[PDB]
Short mmCIF file of C-alpha atoms and ligand atoms in Angstrom, two decimals:
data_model
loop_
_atom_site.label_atom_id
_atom_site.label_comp_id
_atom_site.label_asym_id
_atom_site.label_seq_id
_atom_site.Cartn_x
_atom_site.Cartn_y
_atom_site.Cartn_z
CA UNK A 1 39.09 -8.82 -21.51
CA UNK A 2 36.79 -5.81 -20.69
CA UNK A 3 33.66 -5.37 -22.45
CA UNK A 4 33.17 -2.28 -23.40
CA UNK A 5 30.04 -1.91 -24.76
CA UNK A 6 26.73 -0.31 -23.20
CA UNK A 7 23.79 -3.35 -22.18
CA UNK A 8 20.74 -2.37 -24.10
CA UNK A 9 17.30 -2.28 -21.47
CA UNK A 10 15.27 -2.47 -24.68
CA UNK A 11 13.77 0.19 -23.28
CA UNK A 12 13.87 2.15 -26.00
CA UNK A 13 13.63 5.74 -23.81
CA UNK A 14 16.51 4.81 -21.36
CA UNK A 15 18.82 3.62 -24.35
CA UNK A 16 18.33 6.68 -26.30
CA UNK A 17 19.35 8.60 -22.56
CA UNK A 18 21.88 6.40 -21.99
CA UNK A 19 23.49 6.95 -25.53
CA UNK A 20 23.35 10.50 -25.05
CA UNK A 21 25.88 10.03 -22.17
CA UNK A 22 27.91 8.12 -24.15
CA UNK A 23 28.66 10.38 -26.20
CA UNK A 24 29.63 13.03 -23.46
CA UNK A 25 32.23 10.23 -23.08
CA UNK A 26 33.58 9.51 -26.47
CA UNK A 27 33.19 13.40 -27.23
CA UNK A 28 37.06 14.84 -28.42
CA UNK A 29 38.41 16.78 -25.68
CA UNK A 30 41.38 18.86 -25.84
CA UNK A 31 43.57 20.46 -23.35
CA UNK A 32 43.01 24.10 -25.38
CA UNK A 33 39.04 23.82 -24.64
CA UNK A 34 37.31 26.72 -23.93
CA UNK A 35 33.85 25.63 -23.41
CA UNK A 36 31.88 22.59 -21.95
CA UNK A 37 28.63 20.88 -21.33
CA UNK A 38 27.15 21.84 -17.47
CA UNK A 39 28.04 17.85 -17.23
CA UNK A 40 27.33 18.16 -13.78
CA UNK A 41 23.57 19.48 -14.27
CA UNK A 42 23.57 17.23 -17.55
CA UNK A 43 24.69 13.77 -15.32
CA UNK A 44 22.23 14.85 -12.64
CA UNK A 45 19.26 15.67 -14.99
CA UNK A 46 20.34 12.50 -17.34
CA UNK A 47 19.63 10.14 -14.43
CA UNK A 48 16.74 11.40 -12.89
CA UNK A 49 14.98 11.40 -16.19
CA UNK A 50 16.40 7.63 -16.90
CA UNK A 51 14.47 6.34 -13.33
CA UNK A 52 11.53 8.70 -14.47
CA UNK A 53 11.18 6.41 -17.68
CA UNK A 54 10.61 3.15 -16.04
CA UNK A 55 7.18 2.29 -16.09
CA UNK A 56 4.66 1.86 -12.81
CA UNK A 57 1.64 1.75 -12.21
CA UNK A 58 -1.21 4.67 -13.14
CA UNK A 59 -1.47 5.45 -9.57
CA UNK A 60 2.38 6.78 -8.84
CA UNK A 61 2.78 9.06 -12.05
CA UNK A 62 3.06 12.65 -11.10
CA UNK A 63 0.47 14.89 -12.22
CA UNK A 64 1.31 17.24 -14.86
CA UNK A 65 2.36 20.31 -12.75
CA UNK A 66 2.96 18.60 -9.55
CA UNK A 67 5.56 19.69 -7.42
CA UNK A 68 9.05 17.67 -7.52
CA UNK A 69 8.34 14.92 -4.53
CA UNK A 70 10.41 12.42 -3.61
CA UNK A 71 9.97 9.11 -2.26
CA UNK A 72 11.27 7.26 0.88
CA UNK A 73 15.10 6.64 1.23
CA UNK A 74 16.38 3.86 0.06
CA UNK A 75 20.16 3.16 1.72
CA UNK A 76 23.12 0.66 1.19
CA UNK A 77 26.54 1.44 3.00
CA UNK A 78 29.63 0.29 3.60
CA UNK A 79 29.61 -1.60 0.64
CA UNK A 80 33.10 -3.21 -0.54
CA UNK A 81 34.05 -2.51 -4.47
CA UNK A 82 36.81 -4.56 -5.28
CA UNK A 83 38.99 -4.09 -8.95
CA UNK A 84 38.02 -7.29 -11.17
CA UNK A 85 40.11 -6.21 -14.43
CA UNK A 86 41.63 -2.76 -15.23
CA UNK A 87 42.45 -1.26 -18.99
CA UNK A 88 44.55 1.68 -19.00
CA UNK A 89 46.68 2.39 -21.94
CA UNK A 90 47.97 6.02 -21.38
CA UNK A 91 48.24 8.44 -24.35
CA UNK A 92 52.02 9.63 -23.12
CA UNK A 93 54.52 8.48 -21.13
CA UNK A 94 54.74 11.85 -18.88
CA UNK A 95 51.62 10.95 -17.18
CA UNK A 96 47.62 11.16 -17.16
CA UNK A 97 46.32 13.15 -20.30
CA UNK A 98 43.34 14.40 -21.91
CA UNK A 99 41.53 12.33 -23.72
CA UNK A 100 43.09 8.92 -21.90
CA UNK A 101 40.08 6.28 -21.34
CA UNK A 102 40.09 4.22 -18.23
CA UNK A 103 38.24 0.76 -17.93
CA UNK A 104 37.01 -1.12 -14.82
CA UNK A 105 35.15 -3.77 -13.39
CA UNK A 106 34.47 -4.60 -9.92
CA UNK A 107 33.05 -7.32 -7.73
CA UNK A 108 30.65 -6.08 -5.24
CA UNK A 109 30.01 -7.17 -1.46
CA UNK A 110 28.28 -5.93 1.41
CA UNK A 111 29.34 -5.19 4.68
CA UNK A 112 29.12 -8.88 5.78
CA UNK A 113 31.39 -9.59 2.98
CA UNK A 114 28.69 -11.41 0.59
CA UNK A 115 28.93 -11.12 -2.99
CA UNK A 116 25.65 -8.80 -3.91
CA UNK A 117 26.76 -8.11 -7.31
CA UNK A 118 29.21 -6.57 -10.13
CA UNK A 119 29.88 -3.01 -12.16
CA UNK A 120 31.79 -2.17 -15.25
CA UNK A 121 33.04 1.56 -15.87
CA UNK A 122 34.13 3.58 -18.54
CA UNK A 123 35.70 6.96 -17.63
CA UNK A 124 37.86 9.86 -19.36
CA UNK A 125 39.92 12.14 -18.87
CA UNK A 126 38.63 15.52 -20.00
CA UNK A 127 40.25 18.95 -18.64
CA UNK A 128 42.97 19.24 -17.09
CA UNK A 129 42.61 22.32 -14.81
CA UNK A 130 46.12 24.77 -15.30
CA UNK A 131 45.70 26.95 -11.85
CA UNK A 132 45.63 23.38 -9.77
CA UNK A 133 46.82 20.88 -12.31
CA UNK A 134 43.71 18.63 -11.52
CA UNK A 135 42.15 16.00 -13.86
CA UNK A 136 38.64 15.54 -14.41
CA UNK A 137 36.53 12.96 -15.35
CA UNK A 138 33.19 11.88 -16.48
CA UNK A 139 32.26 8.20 -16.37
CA UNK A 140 29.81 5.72 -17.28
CA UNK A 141 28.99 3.25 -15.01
CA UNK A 142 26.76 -0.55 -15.42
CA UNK A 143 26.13 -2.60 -12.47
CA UNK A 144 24.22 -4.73 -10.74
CA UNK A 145 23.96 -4.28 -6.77
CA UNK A 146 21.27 -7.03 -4.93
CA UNK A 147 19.19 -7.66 -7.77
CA UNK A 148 19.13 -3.82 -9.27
CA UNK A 149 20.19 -2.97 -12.35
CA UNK A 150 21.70 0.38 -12.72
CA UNK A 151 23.64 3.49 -14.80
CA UNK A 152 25.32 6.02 -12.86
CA UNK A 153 26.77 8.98 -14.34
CA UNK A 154 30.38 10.99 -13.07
CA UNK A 155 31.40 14.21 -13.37
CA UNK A 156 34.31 14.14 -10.90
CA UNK A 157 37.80 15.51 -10.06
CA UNK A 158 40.61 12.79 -10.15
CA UNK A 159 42.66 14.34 -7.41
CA UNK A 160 40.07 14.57 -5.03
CA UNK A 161 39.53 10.87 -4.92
CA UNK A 162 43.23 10.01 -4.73
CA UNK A 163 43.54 11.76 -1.95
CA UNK A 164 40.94 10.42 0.46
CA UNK A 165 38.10 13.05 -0.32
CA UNK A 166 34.29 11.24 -0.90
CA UNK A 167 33.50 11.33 -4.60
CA UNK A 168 30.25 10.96 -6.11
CA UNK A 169 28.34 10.14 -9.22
CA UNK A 170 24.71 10.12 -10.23
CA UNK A 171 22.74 6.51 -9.87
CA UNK A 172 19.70 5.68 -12.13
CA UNK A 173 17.78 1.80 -11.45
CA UNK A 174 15.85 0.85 -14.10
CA UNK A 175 14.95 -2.83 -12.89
CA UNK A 176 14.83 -4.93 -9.90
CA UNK A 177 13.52 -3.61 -6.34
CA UNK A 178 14.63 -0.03 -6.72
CA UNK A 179 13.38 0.37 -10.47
CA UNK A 180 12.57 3.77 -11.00
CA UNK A 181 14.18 5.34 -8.16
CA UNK A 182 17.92 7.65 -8.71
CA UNK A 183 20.03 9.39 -6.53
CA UNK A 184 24.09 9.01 -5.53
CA UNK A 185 26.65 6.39 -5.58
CA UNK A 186 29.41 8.01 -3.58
CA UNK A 187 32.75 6.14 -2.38
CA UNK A 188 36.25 6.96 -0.84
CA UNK A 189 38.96 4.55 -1.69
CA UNK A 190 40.94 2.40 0.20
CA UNK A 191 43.41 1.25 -2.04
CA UNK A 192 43.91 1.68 -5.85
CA UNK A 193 42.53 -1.56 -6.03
CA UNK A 194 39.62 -1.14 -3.57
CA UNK A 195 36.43 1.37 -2.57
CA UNK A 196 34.10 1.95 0.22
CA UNK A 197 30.79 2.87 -1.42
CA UNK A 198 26.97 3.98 -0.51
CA UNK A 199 24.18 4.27 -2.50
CA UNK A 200 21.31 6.70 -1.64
CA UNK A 201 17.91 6.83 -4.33
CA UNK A 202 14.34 7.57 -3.90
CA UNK A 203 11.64 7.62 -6.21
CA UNK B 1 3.42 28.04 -48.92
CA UNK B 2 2.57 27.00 -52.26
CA UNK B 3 5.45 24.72 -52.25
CA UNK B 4 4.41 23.45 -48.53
CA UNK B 5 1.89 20.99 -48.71
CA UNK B 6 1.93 18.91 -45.26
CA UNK B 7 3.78 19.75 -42.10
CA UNK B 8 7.26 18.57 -42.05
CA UNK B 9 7.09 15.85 -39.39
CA UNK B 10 11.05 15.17 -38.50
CA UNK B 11 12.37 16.47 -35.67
CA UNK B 12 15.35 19.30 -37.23
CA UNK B 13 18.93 18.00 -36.02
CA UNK B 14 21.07 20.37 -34.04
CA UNK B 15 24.25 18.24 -35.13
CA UNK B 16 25.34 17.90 -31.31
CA UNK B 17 24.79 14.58 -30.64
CA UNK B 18 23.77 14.50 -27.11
CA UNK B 19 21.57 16.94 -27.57
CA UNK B 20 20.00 14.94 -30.77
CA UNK B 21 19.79 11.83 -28.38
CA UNK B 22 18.15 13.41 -26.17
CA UNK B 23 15.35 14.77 -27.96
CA UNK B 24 15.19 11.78 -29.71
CA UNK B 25 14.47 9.84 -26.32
CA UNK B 26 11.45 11.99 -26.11
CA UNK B 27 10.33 11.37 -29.79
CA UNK B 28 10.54 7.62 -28.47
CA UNK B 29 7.59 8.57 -26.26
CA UNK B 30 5.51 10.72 -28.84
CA UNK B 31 5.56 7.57 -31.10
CA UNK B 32 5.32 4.10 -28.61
CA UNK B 33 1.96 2.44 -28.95
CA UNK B 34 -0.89 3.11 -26.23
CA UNK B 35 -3.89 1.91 -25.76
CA UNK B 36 -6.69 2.35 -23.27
CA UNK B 37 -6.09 -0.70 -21.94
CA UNK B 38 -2.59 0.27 -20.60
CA UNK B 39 -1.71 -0.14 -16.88
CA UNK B 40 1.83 1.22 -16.75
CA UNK B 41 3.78 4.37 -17.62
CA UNK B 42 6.33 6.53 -17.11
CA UNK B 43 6.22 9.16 -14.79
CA UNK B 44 6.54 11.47 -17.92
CA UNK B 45 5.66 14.83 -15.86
CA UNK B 46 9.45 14.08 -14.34
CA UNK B 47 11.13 12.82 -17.66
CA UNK B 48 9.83 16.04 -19.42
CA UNK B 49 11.42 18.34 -16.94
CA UNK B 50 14.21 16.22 -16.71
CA UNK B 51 14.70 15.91 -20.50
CA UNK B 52 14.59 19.93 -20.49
CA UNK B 53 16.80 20.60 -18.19
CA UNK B 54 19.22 17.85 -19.59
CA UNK B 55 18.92 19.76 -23.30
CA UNK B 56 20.00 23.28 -22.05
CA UNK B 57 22.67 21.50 -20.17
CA UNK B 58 24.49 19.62 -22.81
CA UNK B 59 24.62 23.54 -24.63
CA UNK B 60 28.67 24.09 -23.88
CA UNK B 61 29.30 27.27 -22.45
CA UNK B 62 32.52 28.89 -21.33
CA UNK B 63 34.33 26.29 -18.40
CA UNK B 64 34.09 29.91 -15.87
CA UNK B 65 30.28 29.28 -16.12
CA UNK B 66 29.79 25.06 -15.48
CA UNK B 67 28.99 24.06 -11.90
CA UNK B 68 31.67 22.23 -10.14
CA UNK B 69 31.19 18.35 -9.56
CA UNK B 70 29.45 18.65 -5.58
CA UNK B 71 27.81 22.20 -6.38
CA UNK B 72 24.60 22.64 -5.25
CA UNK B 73 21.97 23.35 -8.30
CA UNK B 74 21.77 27.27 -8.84
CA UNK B 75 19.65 28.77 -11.09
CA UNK B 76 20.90 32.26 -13.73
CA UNK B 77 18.15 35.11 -13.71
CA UNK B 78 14.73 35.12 -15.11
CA UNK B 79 14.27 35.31 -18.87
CA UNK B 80 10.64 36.09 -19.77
CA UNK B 81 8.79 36.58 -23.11
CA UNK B 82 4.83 36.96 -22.42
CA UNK B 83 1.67 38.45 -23.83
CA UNK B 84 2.61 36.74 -27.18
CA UNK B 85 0.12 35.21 -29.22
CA UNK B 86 0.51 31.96 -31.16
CA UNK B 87 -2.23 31.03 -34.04
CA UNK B 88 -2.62 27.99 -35.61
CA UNK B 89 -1.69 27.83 -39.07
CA UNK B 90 -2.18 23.99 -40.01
CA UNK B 91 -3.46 21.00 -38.68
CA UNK B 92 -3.19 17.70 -39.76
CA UNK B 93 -5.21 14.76 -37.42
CA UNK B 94 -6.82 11.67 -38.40
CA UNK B 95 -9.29 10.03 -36.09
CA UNK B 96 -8.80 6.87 -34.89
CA UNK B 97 -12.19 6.73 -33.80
CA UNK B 98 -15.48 8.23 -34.86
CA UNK B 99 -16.95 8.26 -31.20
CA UNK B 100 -14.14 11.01 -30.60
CA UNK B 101 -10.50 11.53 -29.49
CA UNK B 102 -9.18 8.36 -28.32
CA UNK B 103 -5.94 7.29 -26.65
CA UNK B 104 -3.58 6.52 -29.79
CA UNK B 105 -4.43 9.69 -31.67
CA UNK B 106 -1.87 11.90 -33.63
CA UNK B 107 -1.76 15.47 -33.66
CA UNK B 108 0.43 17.27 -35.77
CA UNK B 109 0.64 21.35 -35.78
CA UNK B 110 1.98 24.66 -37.06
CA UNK B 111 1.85 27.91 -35.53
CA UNK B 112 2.42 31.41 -36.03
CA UNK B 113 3.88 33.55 -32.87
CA UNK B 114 2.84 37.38 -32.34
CA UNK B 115 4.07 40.01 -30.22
CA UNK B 116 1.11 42.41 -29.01
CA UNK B 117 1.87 44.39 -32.25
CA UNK B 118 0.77 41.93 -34.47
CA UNK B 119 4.64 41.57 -36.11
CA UNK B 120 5.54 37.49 -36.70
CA UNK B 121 8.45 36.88 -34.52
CA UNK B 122 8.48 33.40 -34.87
CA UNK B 123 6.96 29.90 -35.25
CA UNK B 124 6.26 26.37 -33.81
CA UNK B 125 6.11 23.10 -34.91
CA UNK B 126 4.13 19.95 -32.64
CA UNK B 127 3.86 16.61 -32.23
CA UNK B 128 1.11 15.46 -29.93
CA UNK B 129 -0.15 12.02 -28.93
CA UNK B 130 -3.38 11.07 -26.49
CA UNK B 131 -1.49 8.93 -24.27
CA UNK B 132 -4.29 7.39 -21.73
CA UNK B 133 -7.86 8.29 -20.82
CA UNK B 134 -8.04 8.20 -16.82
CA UNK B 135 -10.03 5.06 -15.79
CA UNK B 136 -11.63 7.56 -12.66
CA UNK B 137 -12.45 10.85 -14.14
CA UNK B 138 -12.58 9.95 -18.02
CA UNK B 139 -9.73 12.67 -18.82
CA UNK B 140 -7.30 12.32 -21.65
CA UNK B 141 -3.51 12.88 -21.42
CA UNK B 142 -1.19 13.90 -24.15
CA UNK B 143 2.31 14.45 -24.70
CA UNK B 144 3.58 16.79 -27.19
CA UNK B 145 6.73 17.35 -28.74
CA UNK B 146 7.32 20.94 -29.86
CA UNK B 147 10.01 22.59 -32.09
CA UNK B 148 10.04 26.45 -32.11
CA UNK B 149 11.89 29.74 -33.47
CA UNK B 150 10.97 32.45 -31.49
CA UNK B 151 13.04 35.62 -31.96
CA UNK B 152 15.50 34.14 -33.25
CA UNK B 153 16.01 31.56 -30.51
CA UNK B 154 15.65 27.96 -31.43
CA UNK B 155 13.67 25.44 -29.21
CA UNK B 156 12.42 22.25 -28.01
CA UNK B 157 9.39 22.16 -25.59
CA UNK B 158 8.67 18.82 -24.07
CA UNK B 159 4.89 18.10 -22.60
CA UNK B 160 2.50 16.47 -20.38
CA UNK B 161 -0.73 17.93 -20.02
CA UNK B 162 -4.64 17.19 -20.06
CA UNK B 163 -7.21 17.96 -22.76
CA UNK B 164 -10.05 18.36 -21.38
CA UNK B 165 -8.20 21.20 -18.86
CA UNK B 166 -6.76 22.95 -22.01
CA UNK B 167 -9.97 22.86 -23.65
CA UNK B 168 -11.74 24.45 -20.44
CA UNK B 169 -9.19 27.60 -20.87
CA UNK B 170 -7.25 26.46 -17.83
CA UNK B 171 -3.49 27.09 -18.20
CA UNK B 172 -1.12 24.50 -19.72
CA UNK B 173 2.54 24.07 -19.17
CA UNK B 174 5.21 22.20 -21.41
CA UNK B 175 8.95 22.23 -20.36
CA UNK B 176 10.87 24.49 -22.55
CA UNK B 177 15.10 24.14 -23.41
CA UNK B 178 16.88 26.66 -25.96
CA UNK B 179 19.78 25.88 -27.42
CA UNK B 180 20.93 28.16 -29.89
CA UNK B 181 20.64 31.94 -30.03
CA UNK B 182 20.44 34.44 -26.79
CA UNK B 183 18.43 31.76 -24.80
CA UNK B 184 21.28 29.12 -25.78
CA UNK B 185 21.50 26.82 -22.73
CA UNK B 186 18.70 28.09 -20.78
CA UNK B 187 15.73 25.91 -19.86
CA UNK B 188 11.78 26.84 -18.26
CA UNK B 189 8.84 26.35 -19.05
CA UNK B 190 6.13 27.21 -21.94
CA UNK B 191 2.88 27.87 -20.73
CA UNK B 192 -0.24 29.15 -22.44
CA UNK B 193 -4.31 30.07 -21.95
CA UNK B 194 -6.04 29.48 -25.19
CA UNK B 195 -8.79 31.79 -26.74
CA UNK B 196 -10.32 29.65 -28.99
CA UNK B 197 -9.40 26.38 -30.85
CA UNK B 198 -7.20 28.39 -33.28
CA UNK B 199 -5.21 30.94 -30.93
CA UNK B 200 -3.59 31.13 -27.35
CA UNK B 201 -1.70 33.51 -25.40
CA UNK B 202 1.54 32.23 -24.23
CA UNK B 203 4.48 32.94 -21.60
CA UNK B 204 7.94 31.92 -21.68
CA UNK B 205 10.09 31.83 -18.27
CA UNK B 206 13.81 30.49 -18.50
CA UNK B 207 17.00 30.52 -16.47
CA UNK B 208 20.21 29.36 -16.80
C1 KUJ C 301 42.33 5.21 -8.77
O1 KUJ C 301 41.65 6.41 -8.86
C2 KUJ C 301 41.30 4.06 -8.83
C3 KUJ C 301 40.84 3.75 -7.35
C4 KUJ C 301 39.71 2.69 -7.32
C5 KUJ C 301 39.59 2.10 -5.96
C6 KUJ C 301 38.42 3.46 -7.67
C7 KUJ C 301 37.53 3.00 -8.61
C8 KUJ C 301 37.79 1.71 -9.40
O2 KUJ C 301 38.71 1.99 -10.42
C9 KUJ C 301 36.20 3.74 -9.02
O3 KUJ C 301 36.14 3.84 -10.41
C10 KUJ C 301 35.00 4.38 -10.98
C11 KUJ C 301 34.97 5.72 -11.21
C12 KUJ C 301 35.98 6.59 -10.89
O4 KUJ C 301 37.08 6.46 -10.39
C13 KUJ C 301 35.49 7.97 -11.31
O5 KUJ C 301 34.20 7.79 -11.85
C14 KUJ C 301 33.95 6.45 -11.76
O6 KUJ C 301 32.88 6.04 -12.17
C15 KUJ C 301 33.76 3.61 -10.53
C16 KUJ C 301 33.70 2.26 -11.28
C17 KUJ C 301 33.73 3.49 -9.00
C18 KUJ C 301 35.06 2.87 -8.47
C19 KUJ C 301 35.01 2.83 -6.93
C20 KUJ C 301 33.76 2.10 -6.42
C21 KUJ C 301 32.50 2.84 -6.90
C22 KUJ C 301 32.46 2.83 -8.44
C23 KUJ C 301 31.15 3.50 -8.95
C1 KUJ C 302 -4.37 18.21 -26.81
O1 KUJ C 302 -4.49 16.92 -27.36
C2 KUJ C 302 -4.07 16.75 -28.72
C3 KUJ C 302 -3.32 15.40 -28.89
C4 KUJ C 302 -5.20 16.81 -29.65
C5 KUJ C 302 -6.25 15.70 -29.48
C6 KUJ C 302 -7.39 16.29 -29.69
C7 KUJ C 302 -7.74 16.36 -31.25
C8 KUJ C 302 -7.17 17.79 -29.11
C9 KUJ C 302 -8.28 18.78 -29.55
C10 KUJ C 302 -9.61 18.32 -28.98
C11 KUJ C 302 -8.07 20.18 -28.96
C12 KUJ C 302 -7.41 21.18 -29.66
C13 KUJ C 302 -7.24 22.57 -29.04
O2 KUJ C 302 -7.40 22.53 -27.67
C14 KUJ C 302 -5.87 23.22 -29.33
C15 KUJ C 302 -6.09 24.77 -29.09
C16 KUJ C 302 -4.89 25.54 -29.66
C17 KUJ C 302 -5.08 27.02 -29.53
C18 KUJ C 302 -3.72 25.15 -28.75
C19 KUJ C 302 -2.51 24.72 -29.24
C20 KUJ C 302 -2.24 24.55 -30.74
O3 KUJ C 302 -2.56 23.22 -31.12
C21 KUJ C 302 -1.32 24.35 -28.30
O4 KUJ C 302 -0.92 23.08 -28.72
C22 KUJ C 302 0.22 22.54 -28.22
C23 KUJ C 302 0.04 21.55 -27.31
C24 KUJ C 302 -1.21 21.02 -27.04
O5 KUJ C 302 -2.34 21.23 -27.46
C25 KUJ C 302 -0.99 19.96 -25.97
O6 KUJ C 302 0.40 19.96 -25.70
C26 KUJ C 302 0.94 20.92 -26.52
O7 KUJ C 302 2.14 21.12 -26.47
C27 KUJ C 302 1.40 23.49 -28.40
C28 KUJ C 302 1.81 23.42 -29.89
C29 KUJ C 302 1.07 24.93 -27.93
C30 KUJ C 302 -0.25 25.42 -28.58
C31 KUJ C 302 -0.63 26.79 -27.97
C32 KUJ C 302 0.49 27.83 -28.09
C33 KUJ C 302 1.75 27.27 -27.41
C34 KUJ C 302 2.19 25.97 -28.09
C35 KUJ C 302 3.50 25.49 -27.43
O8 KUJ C 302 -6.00 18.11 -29.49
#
C-alpha cells in the first residue's frame, strides 16, 4: 500500500515550499475552469527556491543583487524507472477525468542495471483541453537517486508522454551530493510500466 | 491611530493557500535563530527572487494567458511606479546589544507612501532581521519581510540586502510580487535611495 504522505526535511523553509505545492495538487479542479495558476512558472520558481534554501557555506551565497549564475552540470542518463505499486481508482467509467489522482512508486537503476534508488509520485488530473482533448497534469514527486534526496515538480500534458514525446518536470535536492542544486528530471517511456529518465541540476 | 498602539506583526492572509505557504516559507526565515557564530545559510538572494516570482505565479489568471509545460520563460511589459516617497511612521526595535546592531535583531516598521504631490496612496508594513555580520568586511545582512498597499494594489516584498550600504545612501533592492488589484500576478522588484533615517525615495518595476 502506497504512502501517500509528503517526508518532512525538518527544514522548516523547504516544508513550508513543499506544502505550497501540495496544495496545487489537492486544489478542486473542474472541467468548467476558467482560470489557473502559471503552474509552469510556479513548479519552476517552487524548485529553484527549494535548492536555494539548503544551507552552505558563507562563501557560495549570492550577493544581494548578483546576477542569476549557475553552477557546473551535474548529469545522470539513461537511467531505468521501473513501476513498484500503482493506485488508480478512476472517477468514471468513460475514461480519465478531472480531478482523478494517480499514485506511483518506482525502483530506480542506472544504466548498468544497479539499484541507485526509489521515487513515489502523486499526480492529477487537472484540465482537460476541449480543441485537442488532452489531459494535463501536475505532480509531486519524492525520491531518492544515489544518495540524493529530492522533490520534483510536473506541469505536463498526458498525451504527450503516451505517445513517445520527452516529458519533463522540475527537480529540487535538498540533501546528499547534489544538495542545493535544481534543474530537470525528464523521461520518455518505454512501457506503461517502465521509463527512460535523465536528470540535469546545477547550483 | 488612537486605537493603534503597536504595529500589527502577522503577516495578513490572502486565503489562497499556496500563496499563504509561500509567504509563510519566507516568514520561516525572518524568524529562525542566528547568531554571529553561524557558518551556513541559504543562498537567500535566490530564494527571495524565487519566492517572488513563485507568489505572482500561483495568482490564477485566464488558461489563454499560462505558459505551456516546455515554454520558454517570457516576461509581460514593464509596469513602473517611481519618484514615490515612503516615510516612516513607526518603529518598534529592541536592542539586543548595547555595543550596537547585532546579528539577531528585530526590526519592525510602518510607512506612509507619497506620490510627488504629497497625496497618501498607500502604505507598508516590515519585518526585518540582522541575519549575519561578514567575518571579512564587518557588514551586516538583513532580510526583511514587507507587506504593502500601494494604489490599491496589495503586496509582498521579499529582501536581502546590507546595512551599512543602505545607510551610505546606496540603492537597495527587495523582490516585489502583487497579487491582488491591477498588478495581480505580476512580480519585480522594490528598490529605494533613502534621504534620511525617516524617508526614501522608491521605484517599483514589474512584469508579468
Ligand atoms: C502512463 O502514463 C504511465 C507510464 C509510466 C512509465 C510513467 C511514469 C510512472 O507512472 C512517470 O510517472 C510520473 C509522472 C508522470 O507520469 C507525470 O508527472 C509525473 O511525475 C513520475 C513518477 C515519473 C514516471 C516515469 C519516470 C520518471 C518519474 C519522475
Ligand atoms: C536594515 O536593517 C534593519 C534590520 C535594522 C537594523 C538596524 C536597527 C537598521 C538601522 C541602523 C537603519 C535604519 C535606516 O537605514 C532605515 C531608513 C529608512 C528610510 C528605510 C526604510 C524604512 O525602515 C526601508 O526599510 C525597509 C527595509 C530595510 O531597511 C531593509 O530591508 C527592507 O526591506 C523597507 C520597509 C523599505 C524602507 C524604505 C522604503 C521602501 C520600503 C520597502 O535597521
Amino acid at each position: 500500500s502506497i504512502d501517500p504522505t509528503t517526508p518532512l526535511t525538518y527544514n522548516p523553509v523547504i516544508d513550508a515550499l513543499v506544502g505550497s505545492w501540495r496544495q496545487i495538487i489537492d486544489a478542486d479542479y473542474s472541467a468548467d475552469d476558467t482560470r489557473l495558476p502559471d503552474l509552469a512558472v510556479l513548479a519552476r520558481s517552487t524548485a529553484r527556491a527549494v535548492a536555494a534554501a539548503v544551507p552552505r557555506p558563507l562563501a557560495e551565497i549570492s550577493a544581494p543583487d548578483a546576477p542569476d549564475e549557475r553552477g557546473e552540470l551535474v548529469l545522470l542518463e539513461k537511467v531505468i524507472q521501473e513501476v513498484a505499486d500503482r493506485e488508480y481508482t478512476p472517477l468514471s467509467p468513460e475514461g480519465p477525468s478531472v480531478g482523478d489522482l494517480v499514485l506511483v512508486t518506482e525502483k530506480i537503476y542506472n544504466s548498468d542495471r544497479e539499484e541507485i534508488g526509489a521515487d513515489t509520485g502523486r499526480l492529477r488530473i487537472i484540465r482537460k483541453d476541449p480543441e485537442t482533448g488532452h489531459h494535463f497534469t501536475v505532480s509531486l514527486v519524492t525520491s531518492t537517486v544515489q544518495g540524493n534526496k529530492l522533490f520534483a515538480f510536473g506541469y505536463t500534458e498526458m498525451e504527450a508522454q503516451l505517445a513517445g514525446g520527452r516529458t519533463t518536470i522540475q527537480v529540487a535536492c535538498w540533501d546528499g551530493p547534489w544538495a542545493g542544486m535544481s534543474g530537470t528530471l525528464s523521461w520518455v517511456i518505454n512501457s506503461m510500466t517502465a521509463a527512460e529518465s535523465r536528470y540535469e541540476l546545477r547550483r
